[PDB]
């Protein structure tokens, strides 16, 4: 989306970094992908794989 | 259509309604069939369910060994007695209606065959292609 930047993670394995000024934009974008990688027809009690958020903080 | 039937079936003319006697081209000594049923049927009011070459049925044996008579078992059609169209361009037909017996999986009941089988069923059913003495 507009005004939001993406950064593949440095020095942290299997990690991705988001940065922007609009909380609503970045959060909506974070939600879109974790809905698009959503598992169906199957048991999440046994299957694990999926992208989620480590935390939600400031840049600084 | 069922299991065992490798590849798909292309549309052919339909000659065999239910109650249609046919020959038994097997080596068990069974002589005839009387169709009661089709697997792979269409759904429509007032229809007679049709079978054709390559298709797989349930049916009886009206004449053959008495141990097998008064019992129902599956079968494959091997001769149609009605004109069809192979796309490699020709119309054709065998003379007589015939169907051989086989398990529900597709494995042939008898070990051998008498007479010609169509290219379609031959291409379709490998155990037919292995137990068959003839092709067309």
């Amino acid at each position: 989306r507009d005004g939001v930047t993406i950064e593949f993670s440095t020095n942290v394995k299997d990690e991705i970094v988001l940065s922007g000024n609009s909380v609503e934009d970045v959060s909506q974008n974070a939600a879109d992908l974790q809905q698009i990688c959503r598992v169906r027809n199957k048991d999440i009690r046994k299957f694990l794989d999926g992208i989620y958020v480590s935390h939600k903080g400031f840049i600084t | 259509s069922g299991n065992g039937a490798q590849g798909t079936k292309f549309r052919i003319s339909l000659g065999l309604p239910v109650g249609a006697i046919m020959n038994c081209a097997d080596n068990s000594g069974a002589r005839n069939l009387y169709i009661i049923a089709v697997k792979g049927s269409g759904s429509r009011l007032n229809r007679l369910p049709a079978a054709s070459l390559g298709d797989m049925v349930m049916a009886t044996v009206k004449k053959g060994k008495p141990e097998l008579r008064k019992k129902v078992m599956p079968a494959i059609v091997v001769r149609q007695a009605k004109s069809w169209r192979r796309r490699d361009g020709v119309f054709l037909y065998f003379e007589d209606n015939a169907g051989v017996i086989a398990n529900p999986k597709g494995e042939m009941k008898g070990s051998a065959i008498t007479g010609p089988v169509g290219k379609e069923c031959a291409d379709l059913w490998p155990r037919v292609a292995s137990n068959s003495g003839v092709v067309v």
């Binding site: 009690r45 694990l48 999926g50 989620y52 958020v53 | -």
Partner: protein, 67 residues
């Protein structure tokens, strides 16, 4: 197979990356969702739900009646 193994997979692989947050949030939402339900359900489920909520209420009434 292999009697109880989901728990084994839990201790070896975790429940999820994030399951506990969803689990908390569901119960954070359920208060609003239940009243939003019972205003909805035109016909016979506003009956069954209402009986269920009433049984919940009277059960907890027995619990506070315990002392």
């Amino acid at each position: 197979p292999q009697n109880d193994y989901i728990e084994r997979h839990i201790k070896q692989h975790g429940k999820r990356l994030d399951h506990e947050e969803r689990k908390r949030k569901r119960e954070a939402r359920e208060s609003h969702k239940i009243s939003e339900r019972a205003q909805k359900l035109t016909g016979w489920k506003g009956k069954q739900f209402a009986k269920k909520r009433y049984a919940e209420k009277v059960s907890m009434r027995k619990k506070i009646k315990a002392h």
